[PDB]
Amino acid sequence: TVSTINSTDALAMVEHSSELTLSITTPVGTKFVCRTPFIGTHTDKFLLVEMPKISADDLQYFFQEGFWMNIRAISPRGEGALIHFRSQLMHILQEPVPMAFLSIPNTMQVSQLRKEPRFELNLAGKVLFDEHRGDCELRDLSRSGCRFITPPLGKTYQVGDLVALEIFSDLRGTKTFPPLTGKICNLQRSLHHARYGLEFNEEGRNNAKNLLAQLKFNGTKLTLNA
Amino acid sequence: TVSTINSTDALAMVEHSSELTLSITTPVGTKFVCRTPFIGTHTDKFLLVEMPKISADDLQYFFQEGFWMNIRAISPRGEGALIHFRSQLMHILQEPVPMAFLSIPNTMQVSQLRKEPRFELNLAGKVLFDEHRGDCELRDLSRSGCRFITPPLGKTYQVGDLVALEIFSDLRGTKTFPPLTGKICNLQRSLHHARYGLEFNEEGRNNAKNLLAQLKFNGTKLTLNA
Numbered sequence: 001t002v003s004t005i006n007s008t009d010a011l012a013m014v015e016h017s018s019e020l021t022l023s024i025t026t027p028v029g030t031k032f033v034c035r036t037p038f039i040g041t042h043t044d045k046f047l048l049v050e051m052p053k054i055s056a057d058d059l060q061y062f063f064q065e066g067f068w069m070n071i072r073a074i075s076p077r078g079e080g081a082l083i084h085f086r087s088q089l090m091h092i093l094q095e096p097v098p099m100a101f102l103s104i105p106n107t108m109q110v111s112q113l114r115k116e117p118r119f120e121l122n123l124a125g126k127v128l129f130d131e132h133r134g135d136c137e138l139r140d141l142s143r144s145g146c147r148f149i150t151p152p153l154g155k156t157y158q159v160g161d162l163v164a165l166e167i168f169s170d171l172r173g174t175k176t177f178p179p180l181t182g183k184i185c186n187l188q189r190s191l192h193h194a195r196y197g198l199e200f201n202e203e204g205r206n207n208a209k210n211l212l213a214q215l216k217f218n219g220t221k222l223t224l225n226a
Numbered sequence: 227t228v229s230t231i232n233s234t235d236a237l238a239m240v241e242h243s244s245e246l247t248l249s250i251t252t253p254v255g256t257k258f259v260c261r262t263p264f265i266g267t268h269t270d271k272f273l274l275v276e277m278p279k280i281s282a283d284d285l286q287y288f289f290q291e292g293f294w295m296n297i298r299a300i301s302p303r304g305e306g307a308l309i310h311f312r313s314q315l316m317h318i319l320q321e322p323v324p325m326a327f328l329s330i331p332n333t334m335q336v337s338q339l340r341k342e343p344r345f346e347l348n349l350a351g352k353v354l355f356d357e358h359r360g361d362c363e364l365r366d367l368s369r370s371g372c373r374f375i376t377p378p379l380g381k382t383y384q385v386g387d388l389v390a391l392e393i394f395s396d397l398r399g400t401k402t403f404p405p406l407t408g409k410i411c412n413l414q415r416s417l418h419h420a421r422y423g424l425e426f427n428e429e430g431r432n433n434a435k436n437l438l439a440q441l442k443f444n445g446t447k448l449t450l451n452a
Contacts (some may be wrong), residue, residue, distance in 0.1 A: 011239075012243065015238075015241075015242075015265065016241075016242035016267070017238065017266065018348040037269075038266070039265065039267070039268060040242040040243065040264070040265040040266025040267075040272065040274065041242070041243065041266075041267040042276060042323050042325060043263075043276065043323075045323055046322065046323060048265065048266065048274070050268060050269065090322065092320040093322075095315040096272065096316065096319075096327050097268050097269075097271055097272060097327075101270060101322050101323075148432060160302070
């Protein structure tokens with residue numbers, strides 16, 4: 001799962017100048033999110049960062065000494081990794097150059113990212129198999145495969161079947177993205193669900209890459225950009 | 227050969243917290259050398275470093291704002307690389323924490339290191355071949371092979387000969403390091419020189435690794451530690 005290690009080792013995984021994401025919560029409970037480059041660290045005393053490129057007002061309201069924040073750093077190690085930790089804004093300097101000094105916790109949590117990230121969704125569409133079309137809902141998607149559900153009492157598919165998912169790309173479902181083609185690699189029938197796992201073929205992988213690109217992230221998940 | 231590239235790209239090759247070597251020349255011409263960790267950089271404005279761990283007096287005499295220095299940074303990229311550039315000490319801070327701000331030049335010179343570094347030397351010894359010993363001088367050495375010279379009028383060796391170099395390990399040449407064994411891979415005879423290139427076998431490589439370890443670096447080259 002996730003690993004908790006010493007901050008010195010966790011930060012060694014991060015490249016200087018890389019971007020940090022700051023989720024700030026002010027003393028009165030208001031929230032703000034910004035990003036700023038990671039300078040480096042001083043011994044084990046401070047985490048140095050550049051002043052966020054935000055309006056003077058936002059700096060005034062959300063970037064004051066003493067304020068706490070949850071920071072998320074990135075690491076290129078392996079297929080990537082995310083480093084999460086909580087830090088307090090200790091000092092701000094304007095001379096010789098504007099920069100902030102954050103606190104360093106004893107440990108940080110490191111999350112290894114997957115080679116092929118999976119996205120959770122719920123996009124209606126059609127399943128095309130042997131010239132017949134049925135309804136389906138895309139529930140999980142990665143550049144290599146996906147998971148979809150269909151009406152438990154509609155047409156049934158068997159493992160090994162070459163199907164094509166025609167996902168609606170519009171608000172009212174009439175237009176569809178290029179088809180996600182592949183073979184059913186697994187399935188599960190229950191009283192209320194017909195669950196299927198699809199493994200894309202070359203064509204399917206390209207259209208999947210294209211579909212992920214047309215989608216918009218709402219802060220929680222990918223959805224139709226409309 | 228050596229490459230000259232933009233400092234932003236050159237510094238991206240260096241890992242934060244890694245050690246920097248500072249060769250300082252004061253305004254009155256005196257010289258000093260110290261090492262200190264690399265913090266990171268602020269945008270393209272400054273190179274941040276930790277205060278060198280030297281005596282107060284040395285800091286007073288060699289680490290003042292305005293002083294120029296030649297810096298050498300290391301990079302793990304490839305078999306390694308050395309980044310050389312000149313920098314001026316722009317600002318020193320004591321609060322929130324002691325740290326120095328150095329200038330960043332437009333470009334830096336990057337030198338790729340070899341997988342198997344070669345050392346220049348001149349260590350007398352004996353060449354053992356077919357039970358006979360002759361004089362020689364070790365002139366070049368790496369973990370995998372070496373170059374040595376012998377009296378142009380002494381015994382001659384041919385390419386492919388399995389010889390053993392018994393390098394004297396003491397001040398007056400009577401004791402020798404474990405033998406550097408291998409095959410002559412090339413040679414060159416001149417009026418004043420008999421030059422040979424040796425390729426170590428397994429045994430030779432181990433003794434070579436051991437010999438490099440017993441040697442002392444005088445600041446210019448490796449020599450007998452005595």
